[PDB]
Design an enzyme around this catalytic site. Structure first.
Site, short mmCIF file in Angstrom:
data_model
loop_
_atom_site.label_atom_id
_atom_site.label_comp_id
_atom_site.label_asym_id
_atom_site.label_seq_id
_atom_site.Cartn_x
_atom_site.Cartn_y
_atom_site.Cartn_z
N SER A 1 11.38 31.81 17.24
CA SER A 1 10.11 31.69 16.56
C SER A 1 9.88 30.27 16.05
N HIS B 1 11.50 35.44 22.41
CA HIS B 1 12.92 35.32 22.12
C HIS B 1 13.65 34.39 23.08
N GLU C 1 -17.77 48.87 17.10
CA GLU C 1 -16.90 48.70 15.95
C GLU C 1 -16.92 47.26 15.47
N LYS D 1 12.18 41.51 4.31
CA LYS D 1 10.92 40.79 4.21
C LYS D 1 9.80 41.54 4.93
N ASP D 2 10.08 42.07 6.12
CA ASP D 2 9.09 42.85 6.84
C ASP D 2 8.83 44.19 6.17
C1 HEM Z 1 0.11 44.46 20.39
C2 HEM Z 1 -0.03 43.34 19.70
C3 HEM Z 1 1.03 42.35 19.38
C4 HEM Z 1 2.29 42.56 18.94
C5 HEM Z 1 2.96 43.89 18.68
C6 HEM Z 1 2.89 41.31 18.76
C7 HEM Z 1 4.21 41.16 18.33
C8 HEM Z 1 4.81 39.97 18.04
C9 HEM Z 1 6.01 39.80 17.40
C10 HEM Z 1 6.91 40.89 16.91
C11 HEM Z 1 6.24 38.48 17.29
C12 HEM Z 1 7.45 37.86 16.65
C13 HEM Z 1 7.36 37.88 15.13
C14 HEM Z 1 6.12 37.22 14.55
O1 HEM Z 1 5.99 36.01 14.42
O2 HEM Z 1 5.17 37.85 14.23
C15 HEM Z 1 5.17 37.81 17.86
C16 HEM Z 1 5.05 36.44 17.95
C17 HEM Z 1 3.92 35.84 18.49
N1 HEM Z 1 2.82 36.43 18.94
FE1 HEM Z 1 2.48 38.30 18.99
N2 HEM Z 1 2.05 40.36 19.10
C18 HEM Z 1 0.89 40.90 19.50
C19 HEM Z 1 -0.28 40.26 19.90
C20 HEM Z 1 -0.43 38.89 20.01
C21 HEM Z 1 -1.58 38.21 20.37
C22 HEM Z 1 -2.91 38.88 20.68
C23 HEM Z 1 -1.29 36.87 20.37
C24 HEM Z 1 -2.16 35.70 20.66
C25 HEM Z 1 -3.06 35.63 21.61
C26 HEM Z 1 0.06 36.75 20.00
C27 HEM Z 1 0.74 35.58 19.90
C28 HEM Z 1 2.01 35.46 19.37
C29 HEM Z 1 2.63 34.17 19.20
C30 HEM Z 1 2.11 32.79 19.53
C31 HEM Z 1 3.80 34.40 18.65
C32 HEM Z 1 4.78 33.34 18.28
C33 HEM Z 1 4.57 33.09 16.81
C34 HEM Z 1 5.47 32.11 16.13
O3 HEM Z 1 6.63 31.93 16.49
O4 HEM Z 1 5.07 31.44 15.18
N3 HEM Z 1 0.54 37.99 19.78
N4 HEM Z 1 4.31 38.75 18.31
C1 HEM Z 2 -1.13 57.16 24.16
C2 HEM Z 2 -1.74 56.95 23.01
C3 HEM Z 2 -3.07 57.49 22.64
C4 HEM Z 2 -3.62 58.72 22.83
C5 HEM Z 2 -3.01 59.92 23.50
C6 HEM Z 2 -4.93 58.67 22.22
C7 HEM Z 2 -5.80 59.74 22.17
C8 HEM Z 2 -7.03 59.78 21.56
C9 HEM Z 2 -7.88 60.87 21.48
C10 HEM Z 2 -7.62 62.27 21.98
C11 HEM Z 2 -9.00 60.49 20.84
C12 HEM Z 2 -10.18 61.42 20.58
C13 HEM Z 2 -10.15 62.14 19.25
C14 HEM Z 2 -10.71 61.26 18.15
O1 HEM Z 2 -11.64 60.50 18.34
O2 HEM Z 2 -10.22 61.25 17.05
C15 HEM Z 2 -8.87 59.14 20.54
C16 HEM Z 2 -9.80 58.37 19.89
C17 HEM Z 2 -9.65 57.03 19.67
N1 HEM Z 2 -8.62 56.24 19.94
FE1 HEM Z 2 -6.97 56.85 20.77
N2 HEM Z 2 -5.15 57.49 21.76
C18 HEM Z 2 -4.12 56.70 21.94
C19 HEM Z 2 -3.94 55.39 21.57
C20 HEM Z 2 -4.87 54.53 21.01
C21 HEM Z 2 -4.72 53.17 20.73
C22 HEM Z 2 -3.51 52.29 20.97
C23 HEM Z 2 -5.91 52.74 20.16
C24 HEM Z 2 -6.21 51.36 19.70
C25 HEM Z 2 -6.35 50.34 20.52
C26 HEM Z 2 -6.78 53.86 20.10
C27 HEM Z 2 -8.08 53.87 19.65
C28 HEM Z 2 -8.90 55.01 19.56
C29 HEM Z 2 -10.26 54.98 18.99
C30 HEM Z 2 -10.97 53.77 18.43
C31 HEM Z 2 -10.71 56.24 19.04
C32 HEM Z 2 -12.03 56.79 18.55
C33 HEM Z 2 -11.74 57.37 17.17
C34 HEM Z 2 -12.92 58.05 16.50
O3 HEM Z 2 -13.85 57.42 16.01
O4 HEM Z 2 -13.00 59.27 16.38
N3 HEM Z 2 -6.11 54.93 20.61
N4 HEM Z 2 -7.65 58.72 20.99
C1 LIG Z 3 14.00 37.58 15.30
O1 LIG Z 3 13.16 38.19 16.27
C2 LIG Z 3 12.49 39.25 15.80
C3 LIG Z 3 11.22 39.16 15.38
O2 LIG Z 3 10.53 38.01 15.41
C4 LIG Z 3 10.73 37.09 14.34
C5 LIG Z 3 10.52 40.37 14.87
O3 LIG Z 3 9.38 40.28 14.50
C6 LIG Z 3 11.25 41.67 14.83
C7 LIG Z 3 10.49 42.85 14.28
C8 LIG Z 3 9.36 43.25 15.20
C9 LIG Z 3 9.44 43.89 16.36
C10 LIG Z 3 10.71 44.34 17.01
C11 LIG Z 3 8.17 44.20 17.10
C12 LIG Z 3 8.24 45.53 17.86
C13 LIG Z 3 8.47 45.29 19.31
C14 LIG Z 3 7.53 45.21 20.24
C15 LIG Z 3 7.81 44.96 21.69
C16 LIG Z 3 6.08 45.37 19.84
C17 LIG Z 3 5.53 46.79 19.99
C18 LIG Z 3 6.61 47.82 20.10
C19 LIG Z 3 6.45 49.13 20.25
C20 LIG Z 3 5.12 49.80 20.33
C21 LIG Z 3 7.65 50.03 20.34
C22 LIG Z 3 7.53 51.04 21.50
C23 LIG Z 3 8.79 51.09 22.30
C24 LIG Z 3 9.71 52.06 22.32
C25 LIG Z 3 9.63 53.31 21.50
C26 LIG Z 3 10.92 51.91 23.21
C27 LIG Z 3 11.82 53.16 23.28
C28 LIG Z 3 13.02 53.01 22.39
C29 LIG Z 3 13.50 53.89 21.50
C30 LIG Z 3 12.82 55.22 21.30
C31 LIG Z 3 14.70 53.67 20.65
C32 LIG Z 3 12.52 41.74 15.24
C33 LIG Z 3 13.36 42.98 15.24
C34 LIG Z 3 13.22 40.54 15.75
O4 LIG Z 3 14.37 40.62 16.13
#
Ligand code: HEM
Ligand code: HEM
Ligand SMILES: COC1=C(OC)C(=O)C(C/C=C(\C)CC/C=C(/C)CC/C=C(\C)CC/C=C(\C)CCC=C(C)C)=C(C)C1=O
Ligand SMILES: CCCCCCCCCCCCCCCCCC(=O)OC[C@H](COP(=O)([O-])OCC(O)COP(=O)([O-])OC[C@@H](COC(=O)CCCCCCCCCCCCCCCCC)OC(=O)CCCCCCCCCCCCCCCCC)OC(=O)CCCCCCCCCCCCCCCCC
Ligand SMILES: CCCCCCCCCCCCCCCCCC(=O)O[C@@H](COC(=O)CCCCCCCCCCCCCCC)COP(=O)(O)OC[C@H](O)CO
Ligand SMILES: CCCCCCCCCCCCCCCCCCCC(=O)O[C@H](COC(=O)CCCCCCCCCCCCCC)COP(=O)(O)OCCN
Ligand SMILES: CCCCCCCCCCCCCCCCCCCC(=O)O[C@H](COC(=O)CCCCCCCCCCCCCC)COP(=O)(O)OCCN
Ligand SMILES: COC1=C(OC)C(=O)C(C/C=C(\C)CC/C=C(/C)CC/C=C(\C)CC/C=C(\C)CC/C=C(\C)CC/C=C(\C)CCC=C(C)C)=C(C)C1=O
Ligand SMILES: [Zn+2]
Lengths: 28, 487, 34, 450, 387, 116, 100
Positions: free
Chosen positions: E211, E207, E277, E233-234
């Site tokens: 974008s 931001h 996986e 759209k989302d």
């Molecule tokens: C937890 C995973 C991720 C989340 C939640 C996330 C979230 C976002 C969001 C919300 C945006 C803005 C809206 C959009 O274009 O999609 C964005 C943009 C972007 N993300 Fe991610 N992202 C993640 C992982 C990654 C990864 C792994 C990469 C690359 C290595 C990446 C690269 C980018 C780039 C380059 C943009 C700019 C895109 C553009 O303007 O065209 N993100 N991301």
């Molecule tokens: C704070 C957040 C999270 C908690 C407390 C949590 C907790 C757990 C627990 C208790 C299990 C064991 C039970 C089971 O296998 O079903 C598990 C499994 C797993 N979690 Fe999470 N988890 C979290 C977030 C995530 C996230 C973000 C990912 C992805 C990157 C993930 C990927 C997995 C995978 C791949 C397994 C194995 C599932 C299976 O085959 O049974 N978890 N998680």
């Molecule tokens: C114009 O620009 C924008 C984009 O790009 C074009 C977007 O894509 C989006 C939509 C996508 C968003 C906001 C992605 C979500 C944000 C993040 C940082 C990615 C993962 C977020 C998580 C896991 C939320 C966890 C955080 C919490 C719960 C904070 C606590 C707050 C509360 C409980 C209220 C928005 C709103 C946007 O404006």
């Protein structure tokens, strides 16, 4: 010709810090 | 079919600008033959020839120094005295400035109107200037009236009347001058800088003095001042232009007979009351002034210290600039480049002030309130950089600029006479141009780094600021920015 | 009458007295304690 | 090293100059295109080289209003052969300083450096005036800094009044402002500047005056860079007519100002120019805002009368602005917003007093000595010497000796002062006031005083 | 304007930052459905966190109970099978949506200036996602969990001096045992919150400049507000993702995994087909292809070095594959190569798959080797293709 | 050079494809150069005359509107497009030359990119 | 500030001061220097010495005289009776305005 001296000083600092965190006297 | 590339208005403008650019792409080599943007250290001791400066010492210690240009139609003759506010006391402070006001107020032979009528009947000019360590009275006259001007100067120095009504009138003139210390903020900023930097030393006092001192000034005060300080060994008579050394020496021998001969000597005065630097600051916050002005300074060098030449080179390296300069973005000084490129000041000026036992080296700037933070960062960065990174090109360019300015400013009888008097007071001799150039070219990049590490690195600073200065960084932030922790 | 700030701005003082309740200063001209 | 009170060991000291040096003689070489190159050898190690052009605001009318001062700001910028950055770096490599001045009838470009750098100075100066690139961004930057240079004009009452009465005193080309209005600047651009400069910057209108260089070297460097310039036949400068006029900007508040001016002969007519200069010295005066240094004009008629007989006066003195065929002699003044009528009365009475013959011989000799010492002393400076050479060769082509001027000063009697001042104030006056003008009298009432 | 009175509540200090960063933020009007995967990634993260928190209330991180507690969730917790399948398949869904996100970035050159920091944060987020999902897969303590833990914790043994020390420190002992499981469980609760913070920093960095768009041009002249346009759209993509996810959850819950993790962990025997996986398959193929242990670890690290170095390579000034046909073809080849690497990773280590994997990893690295030279060559396109 | 359309037919196909893709949106190749990509482009764009920059911006808005609408230009409008008529490259090269000259003489840059 | 935009009124104002001398040359539109000094007390002094009953007329169209007097008399009868002051005298002299 000061950046090289700065690099040497910081390298000495980094080495001193390494020997200080890990303290590898029983391995050397 | 698309339009041809002159139909649409924007296409035509694009063609015009492209043609201008192509015109710039091909330079003409007749105009690219001599000038170079790379600075070269040059040796030109042939053009450096100058008329001889004759120095004669009288039996009483009086010195007469002349620079003869008999093709000139004019001359400058005057007296330079090793005296000023620094050599007064706390209760006598301000007496020298009062004497400067009172010296053209009449003698036994001449009354105020006689003296003015004699001078302006020959078209002459009479000048009096007093500073902390130096006092000068000089006349600019035609070649014929050298003897008359010398007579006028000797009379005013030796036979002044100091009438009580004249003293009382000048007392109120000076009191109003003290009550009207405004409009010249540069001078005010430097006065406060001297006062805080040289706190509790004779160098910290103002030339004007306190109001109670001027209220208390009487005839015997002025006579005692002249008796104490205007002595033969502390005075230099300097003449430049259409003057012959021998005639001036004879006239001086005739006229300057009833001097004081007090044994008080300037070296002892400096020794028993020395000047020292105290890291400190004075902030005069006034949010109604449109512009902020501040000075930051380090303790500098005395006149005779060899490092003073290097400090002059360093001052040239920092430079000076104001908003009416055409090419500030392109100069060799990085500080001036930063200021001009980002528009973060109205004016910037590096100063190198020398005294008998100490000096001041710093930067004076004028800027708007919202520019102060970036301006202070830039000033401190470029000053501290002198201790770390100095390029050969920058120091070469600064050496060339310093030599050029020293020789170019020395035009006219009055600047030459002033140079003679000042050098005889500060060095005991007039340093010939070749020696000064040789000392200047001995300042290389390593010399600048050494001097900067002695005077600037991890050193206490003195600050004096006035105006909307709430966003000027505090003393700790200026003090931190005197060293770089990445080295 | 003239207010104190105007007088201070108009009359530089080389005999400055700093507040001493928390800190006592070294004699003026002393070498820095850095 | 050693302390500066001890001579440095092992320094090669050049032999001293003689205590009497024979002055050099001006050499004036004219090129076939009409460009004149002049120089004088000088004993000091400094060279001043300038280019002087008989262009000015008297050529802006009708379609180039503001071009002269813009060209003044655009001096020593990017050329077709060098960028601004490179040119600043070449100037600084040799410790040089540049300057440009714009007037109603003359422009100048000067560079000053040690005499060993003459080829570089000449090369950089001609590239600058012959080959301006006039890049649009550079012009726009110099136009923003022109707005400030014109807005801060109100902060100099003397200058503001001087321009204002130039505008209100003439009708033709001389009335064109030397500081164009803001509306007149939104039209100026690089194409306009190029068209203006190409029309007016011709070889027969330009002089290369160099004080402190041998003529052989200056010719060797400058001839190959100026001969290409074509032969353009000598036109005539336009005529201006002096008229009367009043300038009045009622801003209100405090600290009024005024300037009453009259017409005097121009630089042509070489006995009366002097009568104007000696008159200006006779009235004399001072700024009345600062003091220090006897002999600056504290005992002239203006000073001794106003500042020593009537208090509450902030400024009072005399001025002069002589052109080739006409001039302006006048008296300034500040006074107080309600004291304005008395101030104008005082000024008019002083003009009348010297007109009648109420000035004694002592004051005449005093002013005569002041004139002679002012002219002789101002020639101490190398800069002024070079500029005088350039201006005089542009105007007369001869560089008349100062001795002729000195005799005219010493041939002035009281009868001359009397008849000239009588003639000057028998013609229409130019009144100008700035500040609070409500209490300031009318044009007719002030005109009736003389 | 002088804000004496209160106008719209969204502009009050209580919600001004949410109004400016989430509601009124300017967005290029021509963004395609390819720009809706960042929000999908965020929703996947939230789904994982919520389901994992509620799953952790029933899971026991002990070798004698972990497997049985996972079966007790499937069988005894009301709604437990849905918590598990949503979490397990949610992990696969996160990787799908994040891969599409990354390849969207690669086709539009979204990594290029001024958004280099966005891309580097994304790479860090990808690393965090991999570590989180791996340690999570060990928690069930099946056959795949135990042997997959045994390999990745041995990767440190490639270090000559301290490698064995690092292996035994990560294990907490001389083998994969209860200490390893307990520390994995603790790391696996903590890492997702670091992922949330990293995602927030990612979005803030993006931001700073806004974008990029499918034309790859400057877009200030045609920007619109995120709400409600890109909100709706989302939302379309969110509902479609819900349908996809529901199909996986309710009708094919176990086809994305392996049956071997339903066998309790046996440190004696070893499954003949030890795979990770599917979302780690390309990395694992690039690892198996190099025939030196150290060379394999080096290659794995070189993958992320190449990803991090991509934004900083001197390049041409055109962004979109829409106007870079050769880079576009390189894209479609890279995508095929990644799908080939993933398939090869599932194949046993035996001919012809070894050579195919070596060639595929070579092509993967050639993409990054060749992109900079293309930028340098294409900088001369405007001079060459004149009017 | 191989990137010469007159000498190399592969470069001819490349130029034809790029021109056809640009013409569908009414875009010039110089319109793809973004001020946000480098400070040199930003400086060159700031040095251009206003009408050219306004035409660039209008073409950018038209292209964005077409892209948002999943539409191309009408064929009658496509016939008059000049995709490779330049307005930026010469100024960009001049700015680059001035930048390099500043760097060679040890001067500070006239502008710098912000650290993200 | 928004007065030069109307040349008619600007010239009509300017030629009042350029042609008359004295009070009638005093601008109706004061310059932006006398405004920084205008305050409520300066306006109260101006009104007390000028807004006197003998210089005041209360005129009504559409009203009966009786109840108009009934309402107005208690609100105005207590104004002090002050002598009539002579009008400040102006002089037409002729003159010239100009501004480029
Ligand atoms: C937890 C995973 C991720 C989340 C939640 C996330 C979230 C976002 C969001 C919300 C945006 C803005 C809206 C959009 O274009 O999609 C964005 C943009 C972007 N993300 Fe991610 N992202 C993640 C992982 C990654 C990864 C792994 C990469 C690359 C290595 C990446 C690269 C980018 C780039 C380059 C943009 C700019 C895109 C553009 O303007 O065209 N993100 N991301
Ligand atoms: C704070 C957040 C999270 C908690 C407390 C949590 C907790 C757990 C627990 C208790 C299990 C064991 C039970 C089971 O296998 O079903 C598990 C499994 C797993 N979690 Fe999470 N988890 C979290 C977030 C995530 C996230 C973000 C990912 C992805 C990157 C993930 C990927 C997995 C995978 C791949 C397994 C194995 C599932 C299976 O085959 O049974 N978890 N998680
Ligand atoms: C114009 O620009 C924008 C984009 O790009 C074009 C977007 O894509 C989006 C939509 C996508 C968003 C906001 C992605 C979500 C944000 C993040 C940082 C990615 C993962 C977020 C998580 C896991 C939320 C966890 C955080 C919490 C719960 C904070 C606590 C707050 C509360 C409980 C209220 C928005 C709103 C946007 O404006
Ligand atoms: C794949 C999985 C992706 C799923 C999500 C895709 C959504 C998306 O953004 O697509 C845009 C797509 C179209 O919308 P858009 O944003 O206007 O299109 C943007 C494009 O730029 C519009 O561009 P376009 O008009 O040119 O159309 C291009 C389009 C379609 O292009 C074509 O149709 C190309 C076909 C041309 C050749 C046809 C053959 C004839 C010639 C023969 C020779 C070649 C064939 C060889 C022999 C066979 O191509 C694609 O976008 C698809 C590319 C993906 C390639 C597949 C690689 C993976 C395969 C293996 C997986 C295992 O989105 C929709 O469908 C809208 C619905 C809402 C989206 C919901 C998303 C939710 C996510 C669900 C959960 C995650 C899964
Ligand atoms: C309080 C909200 C006010 C309201 O009702 O909504 C306003 C408009 O609606 C909004 O702007 C609300 C939108 C809120 C946020 C919507 C964005 C959702 C997208 C989320 C994407 C995240 C995806 C990833 C999740 C991990 C109404 O319009 P207005 O501007 O006239 O309001 C006047 C004023 O507030 C009252 O004085
Ligand atoms: C963790 C504990 C490590 C202990 C020492 C670490 C470094 C300490 C010094 C570095 C430091 O503070 O320098 C600042 C870092 O700046 C920056 O971030 C940019 C400068 C470039 C980094 C160079 C820093 C030195 C390299 C040290 C690394 C080696 C560490 C090994 C122990 C700049 O401070 P300044 O005073 O120079 O700036 C003044 C200019 N106005
Ligand atoms: C082999 C190298 C050949 C590269 C040049 C061939 C294409 C040049 C001519 C060209 O650009 O024609 C386009 C097709 O090219 C194309 O379709 C691009 C083909 C590029 C092939 C990939 C380059 C070799 C990659 C080798 C390393 C890969 C490993 C790393 C992943 C036109 O096409 P159009 O008319 O449809 O477009 C516009 C529709 N408006
Ligand atoms: C057949 O064989 C194979 C498999 O089998 C089936 C696989 O499944 C896979 C696929 C798996 C992957 C792609 C994952 C690979 C990469 C990584 C990095 C995995 C993740 C690795 C880890 C478990 C790292 C875990 C991290 C830690 C132990 C961190 C420990 C330290 C901590 C928590 C803190 C450190 C302490 C301090 C700094 C002290 C101060 C601390 C404060 C906070 C104050 C492959 C390749 C394979 O070949
Ligand atoms: Zn004084």
């Amino acid at each position: 010709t000061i950046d090289i001296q700065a690099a040497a000083g910081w390298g000495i600092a980094a080495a001193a810090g390494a020997i200080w965190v890990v303290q590898p006297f029983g391995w050397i | 079919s698309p339009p041809p590339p002159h139909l649409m208005p924007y296409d035509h403008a694009a063609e015009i600008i492209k043609n201008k650019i192509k015109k710039l792409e091909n330079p003409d080599k007749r105009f690219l033959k001599y000038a170079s943007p790379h600075p070269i250290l040059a040796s030109h001791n042939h053009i450096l020839s100058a008329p001889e400066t004759r120095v004669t010492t009288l039996p009483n210690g009086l010195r007469v120094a002349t620079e003869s240009n008999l093709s000139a139609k004019t001359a400058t003759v005057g007296v330079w005295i090793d005296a000023g506010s620094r050599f007064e006391s706390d209760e006598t402070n301000g007496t020298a400035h009062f004497l400067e006001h009172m010296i053209f107020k009449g003698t036994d032979r001449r009354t105020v109107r006689a003296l003015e009528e004699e001078i302006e009947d020959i078209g002459g000019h009479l000048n009096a200037y007093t500073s902390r360590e130096q006092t000068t009275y000089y006349a600019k006259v035609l070649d014929s009236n050298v003897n008359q001007a010398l007579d006028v100067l000797a009379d005013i120095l030796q036979n002044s009347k100091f009438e009580e009504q004249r003293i009382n009138r000048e007392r109120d003139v000076i009191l109003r001058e003290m009550q009207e210390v405004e409009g010249q903020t540069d001078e005010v900023v430097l006065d406060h800088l001297h006062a805080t930097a040289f706190q509790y030393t004779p160098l910290g006092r103002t030339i004007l003095g306190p109001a109670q001192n001027v209220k208390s000034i009487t005839r015997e005060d002025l006579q005692n001042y002249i008796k104490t300080h205007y002595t033969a060994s502390r005075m230099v008579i300097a003449a430049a232009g259409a003057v012959k050394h021998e005639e001036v020496v004879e006239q001086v021998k005739k006229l300057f007979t009833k001097l004081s001969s007090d044994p008080t000597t300037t070296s002892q005065l400096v020794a028993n009351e020395p000047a020292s630097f105290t890291g400190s600051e004075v902030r005069m916050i006034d949010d109604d002034l449109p512009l902020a002005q501040f000075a930051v300074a380090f303790e500098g060098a005395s006149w005779t210290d060899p490092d003073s030449v290097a400090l002059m080179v360093m001052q040239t390296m920092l430079g000076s600039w104001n908003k009416n300069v055409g090419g500030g973005k392109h100069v060799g000084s990085d500080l001036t480049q930063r200021v001009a490129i980002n528009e973060i000041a109205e004016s910037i000026m590096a100063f190198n002030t020398n005294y008998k036992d100490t000096g001041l080296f710093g930067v004076y700037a004028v800027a708007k309130a919202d520019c102060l933070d970036d301006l202070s960062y830039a000033i401190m960065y470029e000053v501290t950089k002198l201790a770390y990174r100095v390029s050969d090109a920058d120091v070469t360019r600064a050496r060339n600029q310093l030599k050029s300015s020293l020789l170019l400013h020395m035009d006219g009888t009055s600047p030459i006479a002033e140079d003679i008097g000042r050098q005889l007071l500060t060095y005991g001799r007039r340093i010939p141009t070749a020696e000064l150039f040789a000392r200047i070219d001995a300042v290389d990049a390593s010399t600048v780094k050494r001097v900067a590490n002695k005077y600037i690195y991890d050193k206490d600073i003195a600050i004096s600021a006035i105006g909307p200065i709430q966003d000027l960084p505090d003393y700790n932030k200026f003090r931190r920015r005197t060293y770089w922790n990445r080295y | 009458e003239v207010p104190a700030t105007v007088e201070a701005v108009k009359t530089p003082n080389s005999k400055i007295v700093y507040d001493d309740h928390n800190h006592e200063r070294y004699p003026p001209g002393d070498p820095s304690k850095r | 090293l050693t302390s500066l009170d001890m001579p440095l060991q092992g320094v090669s000291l050049p032999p001293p100059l003689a205590d009497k040096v024979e002055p050099s003689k001006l050499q004036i070489t004219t090129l076939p295109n009409g460009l004149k190159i002049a120089s004088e050898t000088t004993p000091n190690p400094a060279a001043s080289i300038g280019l002087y052009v008989d262009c000015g605001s008297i050529y802006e009318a009708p379609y180039f209003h503001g071009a002269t001062h813009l060209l003044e700001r655009m001096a020593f910028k990017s050329t077709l052969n060098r960028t601004h950055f490179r040119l600043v770096r070449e100037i600084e490599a040799i410790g040089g300083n540049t300057s440009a001045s714009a007037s109603r009838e003359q422009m100048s470009y000067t560079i000053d450096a040690l005499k060993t750098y003459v080829p570089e100075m000449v090369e950089v100066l001609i590239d600058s005036v012959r080959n301006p690139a006039f890049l649009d961004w550079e012009v726009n930057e110099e136009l923003r800094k022109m707005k400030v240079e014109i807005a801060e004009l109100a902060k100099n009452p003397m200058g503001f009044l001087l321009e204002a009465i130039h505008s209100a005193g003439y009708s033709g080309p001389l009335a064109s402002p030397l500081y164009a209005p803001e509306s007149a600047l939104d039209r100026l651009n690089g194409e306009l500047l190029e068209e203006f400069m190409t029309e007016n910057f011709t070889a027969a209108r330009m002089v290369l005056a160099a004080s402190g260089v041998e003529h052989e070297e200056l010719l060797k460097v400058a001839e190959p860079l100026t001969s290409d310039l074509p032969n353009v036949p000598p036109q005539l400068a336009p005529k201006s007519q002096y008229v009367g006029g009043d300038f009045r900007q009622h801003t209100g508040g405090e600290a009024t100002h005024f300037a009453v001016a009259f017409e005097v002969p121009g630089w042509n007519n070489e006995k009366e120019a002097v009568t104007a200069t000696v008159l200006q010295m006779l009235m004399g005066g001072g700024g009345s805002f600062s003091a220090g240094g006897p002999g600056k004009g504290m005992h002239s008629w203006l000073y001794r009368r106003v500042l020593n007989e009537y208090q509450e006066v902030q400024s009072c003195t005399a001025f002069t602005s002589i052109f080739n065929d006409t001039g302006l002699f006048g008296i300034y003044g500040c006074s107080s917003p309600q004291f304005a009528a008395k101030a104008i009365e005082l000024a008019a009475k002083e003009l009348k007093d010297v007109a009648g013959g109420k000035v004694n011989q002592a004051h005449l000799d005093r002013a005569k000595a002041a004139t002679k010492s002012a002219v002789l002393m101002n020639l101490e400076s190398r800069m002024i010497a070079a500029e005088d050479i350039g201006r005089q060769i542009l105007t007369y082509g001869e560089r008349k000796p100062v001795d002729q001027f000195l005799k005219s000063v010493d041939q002035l009697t009281l009868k001359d002062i009397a008849d000239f001042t009588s003639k000057v104030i028998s013609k229409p006056l130019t009144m100008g006031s700035f500040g609070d003008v409500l209490a300031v009298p009318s044009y007719d009432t002030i005109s009736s005083k003389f | 304007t002088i804000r004496n009175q209160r106008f719209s509540l969204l502009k009050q200090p209580i919600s001004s930052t949410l109004n400016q960063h989430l509601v009124d933020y300017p967005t290029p009007s021509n963004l395609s459905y390819w720009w809706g995967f960042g929000s999908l990634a965020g929703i996947c993260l939230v789904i994982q966190i919520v389901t994992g928190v509620f799953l952790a209330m029933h899971y026991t991180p002990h070798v004698d109970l972990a497997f049985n507690s996972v079966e007790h969730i499937m069988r005894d917790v009301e709604g437990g099978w849905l918590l598990r399948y949503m979490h397990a398949n949610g992990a696969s869904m996160f990787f799908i949506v994040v891969y599409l996100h990354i390849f969207r970035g690669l086709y539009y050159a979204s990594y290029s200036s001024p958004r280099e920091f966005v891309w580097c944060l994304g790479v860090v987020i990808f690393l965090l996602m991999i570590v989180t999902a791996f340690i999570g897969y060990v928690l069930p303590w099946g056959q795949m969990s135990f042997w997959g833990a045994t390999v990745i914790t041995s990767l440190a043994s490639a270090i000559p001096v301290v490698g064995d020390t690092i292996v035994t420190w990560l294990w907490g002992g001389f083998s994969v045992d209860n200490a390893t499981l307990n520390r994995f469980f603790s790391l696996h609760y903590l890492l997702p919150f670091i992922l949330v913070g990293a995602s927030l920093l990612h979005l803030a960095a993006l931001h700073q400049y806004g974008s990029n768009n499918p034309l790859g041009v400057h877009s200030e002249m045609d920007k619109i507000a995120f709400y409600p346009y890109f909100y709706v759209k989302d939302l379309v993509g969110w509902v479609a993702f819900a349908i996809f996810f529901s199909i996986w959850i309710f009708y094919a819950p176990n086809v994305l995994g392996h049956p071997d993790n339903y066998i309790p962990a046996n440190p004696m025997s070893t499954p003949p087909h030890i795979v990770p996986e599917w979302y780690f398959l390309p990395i694992y193929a690039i690892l198996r292809s190099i025939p030196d242990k150290a060379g394999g670890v080096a290659a794995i690290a070189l993958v992320f070095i190449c990803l991090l170095a991509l934004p900083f390579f001197k390049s041409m000034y055109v962004r979109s594959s829409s106007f870079r046909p050769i880079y576009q073809g390189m894209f479609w080849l890279l995508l095929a190569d990644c799908l080939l690497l993933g398939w090869i990773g599932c194949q046993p280590v035996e001919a012809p798959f070894v050579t195919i994997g070596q060639i595929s990893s070579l092509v993967f690295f050639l993409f990054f080797a060749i992109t900079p030279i293309l930028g340098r060559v294409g900088r001369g396109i405007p001079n060459s293709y004149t009017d | 050079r191989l990137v010469d359309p007159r000498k190399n037919f592969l470069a001819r196909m490349h130029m034809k494809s790029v021109s056809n893709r640009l013409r569908r949106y009414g875009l010039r190749y110089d319109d793809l150069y973004d001020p946000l990509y480098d400070l040199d482009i930003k400086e060159a764009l700031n040095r251009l005359p206003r009408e050219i920059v306004d035409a660039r911006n209008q073409r950018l808005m038209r292209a964005m509107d077409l892209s948002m609408k999943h539409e191309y230009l009408p064929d009658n409008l496509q016939a008059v497009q000049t995709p490779f008529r330049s307005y930026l490259q010469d100024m960009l090269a001049l700015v680059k030359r001035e930048r390099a000259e500043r760097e060679a003489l040890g001067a500070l840059p006239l502008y710098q990119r912000t650290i993200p």
